[PDB]
């Protein structure tokens, strides 16, 4: 069936006739019974007003827009927040105890959730719209202040779905984690799908015994507890958190629109040294704040993309104007050069035998070996670009070492070559700080990405192709 954390109840009821089909082993005890048994009426377990509220929630075609529901117990009268969701078989209710039994304070907290969220968003909006690091720092500071956890950080997901910490805020007693990288394997695709569907996931503690779910024998499809927020953590990740030292977790997703359908940009995770069950209003305040976070981050991303395109066009036209005057060999002889048009560590140009280095470039013998390779293998192509000389078929790959690993080439006719090098992804990562652990994850990431550079982005393709076409026209005129 499944397992749930030992701080809430699980009850599954029929949509048509409010007939219970499944219940958690923890429901019969904390709710107030000792009756529940099997095949009874859910409304009989609460008061009349709570029954009316539940019936109204069931009638509504959207299960959402009515959560949470403030219902009361029958045998003891204590409150229980309820969250509803459909599983295409029945209706599932999750009950979590409430610590505020005073009716007067309940509405006060409900309104204060909205007030805190709008105050945090108003604080967020005041920042200038020109960078992303300040945005993430402000967001993590605000979330840490609101939640009062022990460590708050932002994870960013790259093209290869491998994470990276870009912001951090912690009590000055633990080692920092800013700058760490980990492989994409640590995040299965199921977790990404769940985050894209339900934008929250919290863990009270990892040392508690999970509670089995009791199922009915009239069904064969088991139960789809994907939508549940009370599901127990997996064994692997619970062990991971156990070795890490963090016992409580709270992960919320940052979502962008992208080519429309949504895209998971990253996560905001929190860690605590001991168990922490935060009250509901603060949870909703954080949930509301992250929507504005996503909006602003999308705006920043689009603005940065436009500025990058503009700067690329400007440097390309400056290079064109340089090439127009006197010989085309003067491209490499002035400060605005090939290296300034694309993020790279090295570039080169071959022209009538003479070879002009730029940045981290290999010796002329290695250049001519690369050229004879290219004529041997790919002669009818117009360009080539790979992130690793190794694994691409180079027998002389070890000669370069960890300095000329990246690759990008655009031919002129058959002999003149425009060159772009890139080093391995180990000189931009510092991270000064068998058993599953972040250190082992970092070492595994270093091992897997070894002898490889960062992937070339599409905008680099358009830039090099435009420059190449302009160059071809320049020699065609002559």
């Amino acid at each position: 069936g499944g397992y749930i954390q030992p701080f809430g109840c699980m009850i599954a009821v029929d949509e048509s006739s409010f007939r219970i089909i499944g219940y958690s082993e923890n429901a019969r005890e904390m709710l107030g019974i000792m009756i529940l048994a099997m095949g009874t009426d859910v409304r009989s377990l609460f008061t009349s007003s709570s029954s009316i509220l539940l019936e109204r929630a069931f009638v509504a075609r959207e299960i959402t827009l009515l959560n949470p529901v403030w219902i009361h117990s029958k045998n003891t009268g204590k409150p229980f927040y309820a969250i509803l969701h459909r599983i295409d078989v029945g209706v599932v209710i999750d009950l979590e105890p409430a610590r505020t039994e005073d009716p007067a304070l309940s509405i006060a907290g409900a309104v204060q959730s909205q007030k805190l969220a709008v105050r945090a968003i108003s604080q967020l909006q005041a920042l200038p719209g020109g960078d992303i690091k300040l945005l993430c720092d402000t967001v993590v500071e605000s979330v840490r202040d609101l939640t009062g956890y022990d460590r708050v950080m932002v994870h960013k997901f790259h093209e290869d779905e491998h994470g990276e910490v870009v912001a951090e805020s912690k009590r000055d007693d633990l080692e920092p984690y800013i700058g760490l990288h980990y492989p994409a394997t640590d995040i299965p695709q199921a977790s990404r799908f769940l985050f894209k569907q339900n934008r929250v996931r919290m863990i009270v503690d990892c040392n508690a015994t999970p509670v089995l779910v009791v199922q009915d024998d009239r069904l064969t499809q088991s139960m789809c507890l994907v939508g549940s927020t009370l599901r127990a953590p997996h064994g692997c990740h619970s062990q991971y958190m156990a070795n890490m030292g963090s016992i409580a977790s709270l992960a919320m997703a940052v979502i962008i629109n992208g080519n429309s359908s949504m895209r998971l940009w990253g996560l905001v995770v929190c860690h605590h040294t001991s168990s922490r069950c935060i009250p509901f209003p603060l949870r909703y305040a954080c949930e509301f704040l992250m929507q504005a976070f996503g909006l602003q981050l999308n705006m920043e991303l689009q603005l940065a993309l436009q500025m990058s395109e503009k700067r690329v066009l400007r440097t390309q036209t400056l290079l064109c104007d340089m090439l127009l005057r006197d010989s085309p060999a003067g491209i490499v002889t002035q400060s605005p050069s090939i290296m300034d048009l694309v993020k790279c560590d090295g570039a080169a140009f071959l022209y009538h035998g003479k070879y002009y280095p730029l940045g981290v470039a290999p010796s002329e013998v290695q250049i001519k070996d690369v050229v004879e390779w290219l004529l041997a293998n790919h002669a009818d192509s117009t360009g080539l670009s790979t992130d690793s000389l190794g694994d691409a078929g180079y027998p002389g790959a070890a000669a370069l070492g960890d300095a000329v690993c990246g690759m990008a080439v655009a031919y002129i006719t058959k002999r003149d070559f425009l060159f772009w090098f890139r080093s391995h992804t180990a000189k931009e990562i510092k991270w000064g700080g068998q058993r599953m652990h972040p250190r082992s994850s970092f070492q595994a990431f270093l091992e897997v990405v070894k002898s490889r550079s960062q992937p070339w982005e599409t905008a680099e393709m358009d830039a090099i192709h435009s420059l190449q076409l302009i160059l071809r026209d320049s020699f065609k005129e002559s």
Binding site: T100, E101, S142, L282
Partner: protein, 46 residues
């Protein structure tokens, strides 16, 4: 970098110029969770 609360201001015309003078001229040292725990204490219900 604190959440704080909205503070209201009043317009007054002084020295031939419009100025928005403040209304009122021990900072918080605890997280909002601690404030929530302390203030929302129903101990006096007894």
């Amino acid at each position: 970098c604190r959440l704080s609360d909205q503070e209201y201001m009043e317009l007054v015309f002084e020295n031939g110029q419009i100025l928005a003078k403040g209304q009122r001229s021990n900072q918080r040292t605890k997280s909002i969770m601690d404030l929530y725990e302390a203030e929302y204490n129903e101990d006096f219900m007894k």
